[PDB]
mmCIF file of C-alpha atoms and ligand atoms in Angstrom:
data_model
loop_
_atom_site.group_PDB
_atom_site.id
_atom_site.type_symbol
_atom_site.label_atom_id
_atom_site.label_comp_id
_atom_site.label_asym_id
_atom_site.label_seq_id
_atom_site.Cartn_x
_atom_site.Cartn_y
_atom_site.Cartn_z
ATOM 1 C CA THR A 1 146.268 114.915 74.525
ATOM 2 C CA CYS A 2 145.145 118.560 74.965
ATOM 3 C CA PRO A 3 143.272 120.011 71.958
ATOM 4 C CA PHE A 4 144.337 123.298 70.287
ATOM 5 C CA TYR A 5 141.282 125.385 71.265
ATOM 6 C CA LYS A 6 142.342 124.979 75.008
ATOM 7 C CA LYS A 7 145.790 126.428 74.461
ATOM 8 C CA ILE A 8 146.684 130.105 74.527
ATOM 9 C CA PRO A 9 149.459 130.849 71.896
ATOM 10 C CA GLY A 10 152.539 132.691 72.998
ATOM 11 C CA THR A 11 152.012 131.772 76.614
ATOM 12 C CA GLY A 12 152.527 128.979 79.081
ATOM 13 C CA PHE A 13 148.717 128.904 79.617
ATOM 14 C CA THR A 14 145.827 126.477 79.143
ATOM 15 C CA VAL A 15 142.119 126.937 79.866
ATOM 16 C CA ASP A 16 139.824 124.195 81.300
ATOM 17 C CA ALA A 17 142.489 121.502 80.497
ATOM 18 C CA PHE A 18 142.792 119.185 83.550
ATOM 19 C CA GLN A 19 141.953 115.773 81.947
ATOM 20 C CA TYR A 20 145.084 115.368 79.828
ATOM 21 C CA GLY A 21 147.739 114.719 82.525
ATOM 22 C CA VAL A 22 150.759 117.074 82.517
ATOM 23 C CA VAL A 23 150.420 119.406 79.463
ATOM 24 C CA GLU A 24 153.851 120.086 77.824
ATOM 25 C CA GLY A 25 154.921 123.653 78.402
ATOM 26 C CA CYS A 26 152.026 124.617 80.692
ATOM 27 C CA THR A 27 153.137 126.816 83.599
ATOM 28 C CA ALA A 28 149.607 127.937 84.744
ATOM 29 C CA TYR A 29 146.240 126.157 84.334
ATOM 30 C CA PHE A 30 143.182 128.492 84.252
ATOM 31 C CA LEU A 31 139.748 127.238 85.369
ATOM 32 C CA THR A 32 136.830 129.362 84.099
ATOM 33 C CA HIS A 33 134.114 127.806 86.362
ATOM 34 C CA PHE A 34 133.210 124.843 88.638
ATOM 35 C CA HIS A 35 131.310 122.618 86.188
ATOM 36 C CA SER A 36 132.478 118.966 85.785
ATOM 37 C CA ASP A 37 133.005 118.996 82.012
ATOM 38 C CA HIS A 38 135.539 121.847 82.651
ATOM 39 C CA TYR A 39 137.257 120.736 85.865
ATOM 40 C CA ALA A 40 137.454 116.979 84.681
ATOM 41 C CA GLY A 41 140.730 115.748 86.094
ATOM 42 C CA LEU A 42 141.393 117.979 89.156
ATOM 43 C CA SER A 43 141.739 116.388 92.717
ATOM 44 C CA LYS A 44 143.771 116.703 96.033
ATOM 45 C CA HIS A 45 146.830 115.284 94.237
ATOM 46 C CA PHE A 46 147.059 118.133 91.636
ATOM 47 C CA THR A 47 150.427 119.945 92.012
ATOM 48 C CA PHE A 48 150.453 122.765 89.387
ATOM 49 C CA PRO A 49 149.255 126.425 89.774
ATOM 50 C CA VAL A 50 145.498 126.887 89.232
ATOM 51 C CA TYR A 51 144.227 130.358 88.432
ATOM 52 C CA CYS A 52 140.472 131.150 88.984
ATOM 53 C CA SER A 53 137.927 133.309 90.789
ATOM 54 C CA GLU A 54 137.607 133.399 94.629
ATOM 55 C CA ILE A 55 134.354 131.419 94.452
ATOM 56 C CA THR A 56 135.843 128.726 92.186
ATOM 57 C CA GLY A 57 138.848 128.575 94.564
ATOM 58 C CA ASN A 58 136.473 128.005 97.579
ATOM 59 C CA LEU A 59 134.921 125.035 95.726
ATOM 60 C CA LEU A 60 138.337 123.588 94.675
ATOM 61 C CA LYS A 61 139.531 123.607 98.321
ATOM 62 C CA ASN A 62 136.305 122.316 100.043
ATOM 63 C CA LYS A 63 134.708 120.039 97.453
ATOM 64 C CA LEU A 64 137.677 118.645 95.496
ATOM 65 C CA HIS A 65 140.337 119.159 98.372
ATOM 66 C CA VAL A 66 142.914 120.712 96.155
ATOM 67 C CA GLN A 67 145.664 122.017 98.450
ATOM 68 C CA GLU A 68 145.731 125.668 99.297
ATOM 69 C CA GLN A 69 149.282 126.217 98.006
ATOM 70 C CA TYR A 70 148.186 125.489 94.387
ATOM 71 C CA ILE A 71 145.010 127.728 94.434
ATOM 72 C CA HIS A 72 145.529 131.240 93.024
ATOM 73 C CA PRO A 73 142.313 133.279 93.292
ATOM 74 C CA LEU A 74 142.151 136.630 91.356
ATOM 75 C CA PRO A 75 139.770 139.535 91.844
ATOM 76 C CA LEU A 76 137.445 140.538 89.003
ATOM 77 C CA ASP A 77 137.726 143.661 86.889
ATOM 78 C CA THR A 78 141.399 144.139 87.898
ATOM 79 C CA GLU A 79 144.599 144.067 85.783
ATOM 80 C CA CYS A 80 146.833 141.249 87.178
ATOM 81 C CA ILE A 81 150.284 140.016 86.007
ATOM 82 C CA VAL A 82 150.580 136.185 85.820
ATOM 83 C CA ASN A 83 153.942 134.599 84.793
ATOM 84 C CA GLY A 84 154.840 137.951 83.145
ATOM 85 C CA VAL A 85 151.563 138.342 81.197
ATOM 86 C CA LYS A 86 148.723 140.834 81.914
ATOM 87 C CA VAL A 87 145.275 139.178 82.445
ATOM 88 C CA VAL A 88 141.809 140.350 83.555
ATOM 89 C CA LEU A 89 138.876 138.240 84.830
ATOM 90 C CA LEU A 90 135.357 139.351 83.919
ATOM 91 C CA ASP A 91 131.948 138.089 85.148
ATOM 92 C CA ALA A 92 130.577 135.528 82.579
ATOM 93 C CA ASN A 93 126.872 135.701 83.669
ATOM 94 C CA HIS A 94 126.922 131.830 83.900
ATOM 95 C CA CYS A 95 126.980 130.065 87.357
ATOM 96 C CA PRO A 96 128.476 131.555 90.587
ATOM 97 C CA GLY A 97 132.234 132.236 90.233
ATOM 98 C CA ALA A 98 132.229 131.792 86.374
ATOM 99 C CA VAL A 99 134.609 134.124 84.463
ATOM 100 C CA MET A 100 135.778 135.169 80.982
ATOM 101 C CA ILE A 101 139.529 135.769 80.696
ATOM 102 C CA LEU A 102 141.244 138.647 78.751
ATOM 103 C CA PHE A 103 144.889 137.897 77.879
ATOM 104 C CA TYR A 104 147.234 140.708 76.741
ATOM 105 C CA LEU A 105 149.941 138.803 74.822
ATOM 106 C CA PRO A 106 153.567 139.939 74.852
ATOM 107 C CA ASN A 107 153.421 140.490 71.014
ATOM 108 C CA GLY A 108 150.440 142.982 71.214
ATOM 109 C CA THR A 109 147.645 140.422 70.339
ATOM 110 C CA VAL A 110 144.562 140.567 72.709
ATOM 111 C CA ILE A 111 142.579 137.326 73.248
ATOM 112 C CA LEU A 112 139.121 136.942 74.982
ATOM 113 C CA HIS A 113 138.164 133.408 76.228
ATOM 114 C CA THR A 114 134.458 133.526 77.199
ATOM 115 C CA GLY A 115 134.443 130.190 79.129
ATOM 116 C CA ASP A 116 130.761 129.357 79.388
ATOM 117 C CA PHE A 117 128.669 132.633 79.288
ATOM 118 C CA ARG A 118 125.250 134.146 78.838
ATOM 119 C CA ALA A 119 125.969 137.317 76.760
ATOM 120 C CA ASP A 120 124.393 140.506 77.983
ATOM 121 C CA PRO A 121 124.382 144.210 76.844
ATOM 122 C CA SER A 122 125.966 145.067 80.261
ATOM 123 C CA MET A 123 129.202 143.472 78.959
ATOM 124 C CA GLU A 124 129.500 146.247 76.387
ATOM 125 C CA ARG A 125 130.431 148.505 79.481
ATOM 126 C CA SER A 126 132.954 146.299 81.181
ATOM 127 C CA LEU A 127 136.717 146.700 80.625
ATOM 128 C CA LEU A 128 136.010 145.281 77.107
ATOM 129 C CA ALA A 129 134.858 148.691 75.907
ATOM 130 C CA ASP A 130 138.416 150.036 75.810
ATOM 131 C CA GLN A 131 140.040 147.911 73.156
ATOM 132 C CA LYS A 132 140.379 145.646 70.294
ATOM 133 C CA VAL A 133 140.240 141.806 70.418
ATOM 134 C CA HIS A 134 142.134 139.788 67.801
ATOM 135 C CA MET A 135 140.924 136.284 68.806
ATOM 136 C CA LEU A 136 137.592 135.218 70.521
ATOM 137 C CA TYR A 137 137.359 131.721 71.981
ATOM 138 C CA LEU A 138 133.539 131.521 72.021
ATOM 139 C CA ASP A 139 130.897 129.460 73.961
ATOM 140 C CA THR A 140 128.834 128.345 70.906
ATOM 141 C CA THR A 141 126.436 126.070 72.852
ATOM 142 C CA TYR A 142 123.261 127.523 71.232
ATOM 143 C CA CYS A 143 124.754 128.899 67.966
ATOM 144 C CA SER A 144 121.685 128.362 65.668
ATOM 145 C CA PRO A 145 118.545 130.538 65.245
ATOM 146 C CA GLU A 146 116.156 127.819 66.471
ATOM 147 C CA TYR A 147 117.551 128.288 69.987
ATOM 148 C CA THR A 148 115.179 130.781 71.607
ATOM 149 C CA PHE A 149 114.180 131.097 75.255
ATOM 150 C CA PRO A 150 112.915 133.860 77.631
ATOM 151 C CA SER A 151 114.891 136.134 79.932
ATOM 152 C CA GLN A 152 115.835 134.673 83.330
ATOM 153 C CA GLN A 153 113.599 137.450 84.966
ATOM 154 C CA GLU A 154 110.484 136.155 83.034
ATOM 155 C CA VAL A 155 111.172 132.553 83.941
ATOM 156 C CA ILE A 156 111.565 133.450 87.665
ATOM 157 C CA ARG A 157 108.303 135.548 87.501
ATOM 158 C CA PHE A 158 106.503 132.427 86.206
ATOM 159 C CA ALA A 159 108.009 130.125 88.901
ATOM 160 C CA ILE A 160 107.210 132.512 91.872
ATOM 161 C CA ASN A 161 103.601 133.077 90.658
ATOM 162 C CA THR A 162 103.017 129.307 90.092
ATOM 163 C CA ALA A 163 104.392 128.341 93.511
ATOM 164 C CA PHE A 164 102.627 131.128 95.462
ATOM 165 C CA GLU A 165 99.253 130.288 93.805
ATOM 166 C CA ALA A 166 99.549 126.534 94.503
ATOM 167 C CA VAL A 167 100.541 126.844 98.182
ATOM 168 C CA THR A 168 97.922 129.576 98.894
ATOM 169 C CA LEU A 169 95.243 127.276 97.465
ATOM 170 C CA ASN A 170 96.700 124.297 99.424
ATOM 171 C CA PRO A 171 98.822 125.089 102.524
ATOM 172 C CA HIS A 172 99.651 121.416 102.751
ATOM 173 C CA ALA A 173 101.550 121.348 99.390
ATOM 174 C CA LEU A 174 105.360 120.864 99.347
ATOM 175 C CA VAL A 175 107.532 122.508 96.699
ATOM 176 C CA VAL A 176 110.539 120.499 95.376
ATOM 177 C CA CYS A 177 113.302 121.841 93.001
ATOM 178 C CA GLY A 178 115.870 119.674 91.145
ATOM 179 C CA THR A 179 119.634 120.413 90.996
ATOM 180 C CA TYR A 180 122.821 118.606 89.714
ATOM 181 C CA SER A 181 125.541 121.264 89.623
ATOM 182 C CA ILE A 182 126.011 124.837 90.734
ATOM 183 C CA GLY A 183 124.081 127.475 88.860
ATOM 184 C CA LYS A 184 120.362 128.429 88.657
ATOM 185 C CA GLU A 185 120.150 129.058 92.468
ATOM 186 C CA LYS A 186 117.699 131.948 91.794
ATOM 187 C CA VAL A 187 114.989 129.370 90.962
ATOM 188 C CA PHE A 188 114.776 127.877 94.495
ATOM 189 C CA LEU A 189 115.778 131.074 96.312
ATOM 190 C CA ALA A 190 113.043 133.214 94.708
ATOM 191 C CA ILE A 191 110.353 130.506 95.386
ATOM 192 C CA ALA A 192 111.402 130.079 99.065
ATOM 193 C CA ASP A 193 111.416 133.895 99.556
ATOM 194 C CA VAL A 194 107.789 134.281 98.274
ATOM 195 C CA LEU A 195 106.677 131.362 100.548
ATOM 196 C CA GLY A 196 108.410 132.690 103.661
ATOM 197 C CA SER A 197 110.588 129.669 104.020
ATOM 198 C CA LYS A 198 114.233 128.565 104.157
ATOM 199 C CA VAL A 199 115.335 126.105 101.527
ATOM 200 C CA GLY A 200 115.948 122.563 102.854
ATOM 201 C CA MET A 201 118.651 120.254 101.419
ATOM 202 C CA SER A 202 121.279 117.531 102.041
ATOM 203 C CA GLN A 203 124.468 118.207 103.928
ATOM 204 C CA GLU A 204 126.497 117.811 100.657
ATOM 205 C CA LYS A 205 124.429 120.483 98.822
ATOM 206 C CA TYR A 206 124.487 122.863 101.849
ATOM 207 C CA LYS A 207 128.311 122.648 101.846
ATOM 208 C CA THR A 208 128.440 123.572 98.145
ATOM 209 C CA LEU A 209 126.151 126.576 98.646
ATOM 210 C CA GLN A 210 128.258 127.746 101.625
ATOM 211 C CA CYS A 211 131.257 128.252 99.193
ATOM 212 C CA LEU A 212 129.366 130.746 96.922
ATOM 213 C CA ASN A 213 129.641 134.088 98.739
ATOM 214 C CA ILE A 214 125.865 134.693 98.522
ATOM 215 C CA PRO A 215 124.836 137.564 100.844
ATOM 216 C CA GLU A 216 122.938 136.551 103.977
ATOM 217 C CA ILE A 217 122.982 132.822 102.902
ATOM 218 C CA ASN A 218 122.602 131.624 106.521
ATOM 219 C CA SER A 219 119.163 133.347 106.537
ATOM 220 C CA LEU A 220 118.109 131.477 103.280
ATOM 221 C CA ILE A 221 119.103 127.790 103.550
ATOM 222 C CA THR A 222 119.126 124.842 106.047
ATOM 223 C CA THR A 223 119.765 121.102 106.548
ATOM 224 C CA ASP A 224 116.668 120.821 108.796
ATOM 225 C CA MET A 225 114.166 119.503 106.250
ATOM 226 C CA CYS A 226 111.283 119.473 108.786
ATOM 227 C CA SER A 227 111.539 123.239 109.191
ATOM 228 C CA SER A 228 111.331 124.035 105.404
ATOM 229 C CA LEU A 229 108.521 123.828 102.779
ATOM 230 C CA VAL A 230 110.865 124.181 99.764
ATOM 231 C CA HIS A 231 113.167 121.085 99.384
ATOM 232 C CA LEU A 232 116.105 120.495 96.966
ATOM 233 C CA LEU A 233 116.711 117.067 95.515
ATOM 234 C CA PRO A 234 119.000 115.587 92.926
ATOM 235 C CA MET A 235 117.693 116.145 89.404
ATOM 236 C CA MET A 236 117.480 112.355 88.828
ATOM 237 C CA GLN A 237 114.801 112.078 91.502
ATOM 238 C CA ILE A 238 112.480 114.671 89.842
ATOM 239 C CA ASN A 239 110.016 112.074 88.431
ATOM 240 C CA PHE A 240 106.740 110.590 89.729
ATOM 241 C CA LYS A 241 108.503 107.577 91.355
ATOM 242 C CA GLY A 242 111.157 109.640 93.121
ATOM 243 C CA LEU A 243 108.691 112.256 94.252
ATOM 244 C CA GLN A 244 106.271 109.641 95.662
ATOM 245 C CA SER A 245 109.162 108.202 97.595
ATOM 246 C CA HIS A 246 110.156 111.591 98.943
ATOM 247 C CA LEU A 247 106.527 112.442 100.055
ATOM 248 C CA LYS A 248 106.452 109.223 102.200
ATOM 249 C CA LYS A 249 109.481 110.433 104.140
ATOM 250 C CA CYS A 250 107.749 113.689 105.150
ATOM 251 C CA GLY A 251 105.747 112.245 108.092
ATOM 252 C CA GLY A 252 102.213 113.161 106.927
ATOM 253 C CA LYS A 253 102.965 116.873 106.819
ATOM 254 C CA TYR A 254 102.066 117.214 103.108
ATOM 255 C CA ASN A 255 99.395 115.823 100.745
ATOM 256 C CA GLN A 256 100.590 117.346 97.400
ATOM 257 C CA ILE A 257 103.973 118.059 95.590
ATOM 258 C CA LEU A 258 104.629 120.776 93.064
ATOM 259 C CA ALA A 259 108.111 120.256 91.432
ATOM 260 C CA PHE A 260 110.357 122.245 89.173
ATOM 261 C CA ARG A 261 113.015 120.900 86.694
ATOM 262 C CA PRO A 262 115.156 123.647 85.437
ATOM 263 C CA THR A 263 116.407 122.627 81.980
ATOM 264 C CA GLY A 264 118.287 124.386 79.229
ATOM 265 C CA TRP A 265 116.564 124.741 75.905
ATOM 266 C CA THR A 266 114.020 121.990 74.973
ATOM 267 C CA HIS A 267 112.047 121.585 71.658
ATOM 268 C CA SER A 268 108.730 122.713 73.267
ATOM 269 C CA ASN A 269 110.390 126.264 73.198
ATOM 270 C CA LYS A 270 109.805 126.129 69.396
ATOM 271 C CA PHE A 271 106.020 126.113 70.105
ATOM 272 C CA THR A 272 105.032 127.112 73.665
ATOM 273 C CA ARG A 273 105.392 130.600 75.295
ATOM 274 C CA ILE A 274 106.533 130.714 78.933
ATOM 275 C CA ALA A 275 103.114 132.017 80.045
ATOM 276 C CA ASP A 276 101.365 128.998 78.412
ATOM 277 C CA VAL A 277 103.599 126.283 79.981
ATOM 278 C CA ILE A 278 101.730 123.434 81.760
ATOM 279 C CA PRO A 279 102.976 120.568 83.949
ATOM 280 C CA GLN A 280 102.952 116.745 83.750
ATOM 281 C CA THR A 281 100.617 115.411 86.430
ATOM 282 C CA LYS A 282 99.983 112.046 88.090
ATOM 283 C CA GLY A 283 97.550 112.136 90.992
ATOM 284 C CA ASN A 284 98.752 114.539 93.717
ATOM 285 C CA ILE A 285 102.183 115.236 91.899
ATOM 286 C CA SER A 286 102.782 117.920 89.279
ATOM 287 C CA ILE A 287 106.166 118.580 87.472
ATOM 288 C CA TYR A 288 107.084 121.775 85.551
ATOM 289 C CA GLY A 289 110.043 121.903 83.127
ATOM 290 C CA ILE A 290 111.166 125.503 83.018
ATOM 291 C CA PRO A 291 113.714 126.841 80.414
ATOM 292 C CA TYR A 292 116.114 128.740 82.729
ATOM 293 C CA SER A 293 119.316 129.101 80.637
ATOM 294 C CA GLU A 294 122.794 130.149 81.774
ATOM 295 C CA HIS A 295 124.063 130.132 78.135
ATOM 296 C CA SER A 296 123.548 132.817 75.430
ATOM 297 C CA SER A 297 120.513 132.544 73.127
ATOM 298 C CA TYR A 298 121.397 132.764 69.416
ATOM 299 C CA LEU A 299 120.313 136.443 69.317
ATOM 300 C CA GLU A 300 122.275 137.379 72.551
ATOM 301 C CA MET A 301 125.439 135.708 71.100
ATOM 302 C CA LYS A 302 125.051 137.456 67.733
ATOM 303 C CA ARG A 303 124.648 140.855 69.397
ATOM 304 C CA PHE A 304 127.750 140.407 71.553
ATOM 305 C CA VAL A 305 129.959 139.257 68.677
ATOM 306 C CA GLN A 306 128.741 142.000 66.226
ATOM 307 C CA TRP A 307 129.560 144.564 68.998
ATOM 308 C CA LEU A 308 132.987 143.125 69.819
ATOM 309 C CA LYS A 309 134.051 142.770 66.130
ATOM 310 C CA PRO A 310 136.743 140.155 66.684
ATOM 311 C CA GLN A 311 139.247 139.417 63.900
ATOM 312 C CA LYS A 312 139.037 135.631 64.288
ATOM 313 C CA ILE A 313 136.542 133.320 66.172
ATOM 314 C CA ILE A 314 137.491 129.865 67.619
ATOM 315 C CA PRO A 315 134.376 127.920 68.853
ATOM 316 C CA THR A 316 134.791 125.882 72.057
ATOM 317 C CA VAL A 317 131.369 123.967 71.919
ATOM 318 C CA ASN A 318 129.877 121.695 69.231
ATOM 319 C CA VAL A 319 133.328 121.212 67.650
ATOM 320 C CA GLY A 320 133.113 117.423 67.149
ATOM 321 C CA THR A 321 131.156 117.138 63.827
ATOM 322 C CA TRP A 322 131.837 118.571 60.427
ATOM 323 C CA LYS A 323 128.216 119.601 60.039
ATOM 324 C CA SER A 324 128.314 121.594 63.344
ATOM 325 C CA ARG A 325 131.593 123.298 62.422
ATOM 326 C CA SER A 326 130.316 124.227 58.921
ATOM 327 C CA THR A 327 127.015 125.656 60.323
ATOM 328 C CA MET A 328 128.869 127.833 62.886
ATOM 329 C CA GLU A 329 131.353 129.191 60.256
ATOM 330 C CA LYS A 330 128.385 130.207 58.032
ATOM 331 C CA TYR A 331 126.756 132.245 60.810
ATOM 332 C CA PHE A 332 130.060 133.950 61.745
ATOM 333 C CA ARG A 333 130.448 135.111 58.066
ATOM 334 C CA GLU A 334 126.866 136.352 57.963
ATOM 335 C CA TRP A 335 127.357 138.328 61.106
ATOM 336 C CA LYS A 336 130.557 139.902 59.767
ATOM 337 C CA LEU A 337 128.997 140.832 56.345
ATOM 338 C CA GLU A 338 125.882 142.259 57.998
ATOM 339 C CA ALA A 339 127.847 144.511 60.450
ATOM 340 C CA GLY A 340 130.754 145.311 58.069
ATOM 341 C CA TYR A 341 133.841 144.279 60.101
HETATM 342 NI NI1 NI B 401 129.157 125.427 82.397
#
């Protein structure tokens, strides 16, 4: 059974609700982004209207085989009428094709559903500037002040400089980057660009990347691993065993691996500055965990909500424990008393 925080009152709509069978009264299912916790349940047999971005629709058709007749892609930043209700899709600053959804209810209520997002001051000049929001359905993934991490631009600066130094010292070093979903593509694209290389990967991963509308993609990626000195592998293989195994397959071309594991937040963020980060090393293999987040930090979240001044907040993450729910409600009341709304 579909939980309440995935239903949109006064409409036939649900958000990210595909794992519950047929939802009673649902005339249109919205999908905010192509991540498995959110699409859980969709397949080629799905027969109801799905509303999403163009990029998410490309992935539904090619990776999950959903039939074309049930995919309804909408442009961003554009007022659209769906089943007699005005909606707008906005860029969520999460993974490629991820959106927030503005719903203008027939009774005059305005609701914002963030999906998953990384809040940014640029959002304060989207179509959100214009008007009041009565209800915010909020991505609360890192809603506590201990969750700190650097900007994505600082993290990429660190990765490019680390890779370029290593390979200039040793031209026979291979660079490997881990992946398990869409998102974080800048990590491996920025490294391959500084090294003058295409990125090499499996046929399955190449197919996924070909759905993303990235400009000049055919100039940046390949399935010919022998032509590339930046390889992608599943995240599960980014360990000394899996990396040793990979290096054997490379035909004596390389004598060293430098690997990157993009993570979200980890507890070493509570102590160690990005500049000071060091790898784990075994012999000729080194592995860097880098904190490249596609979710809001606590401070980014707080800024966005204090700017928006919503009348009511419904969290969509960390909702399963009483202790989590109580902590989140305390910070929402602080924010409101501090800013005066
Ligand atoms: Ni996500």
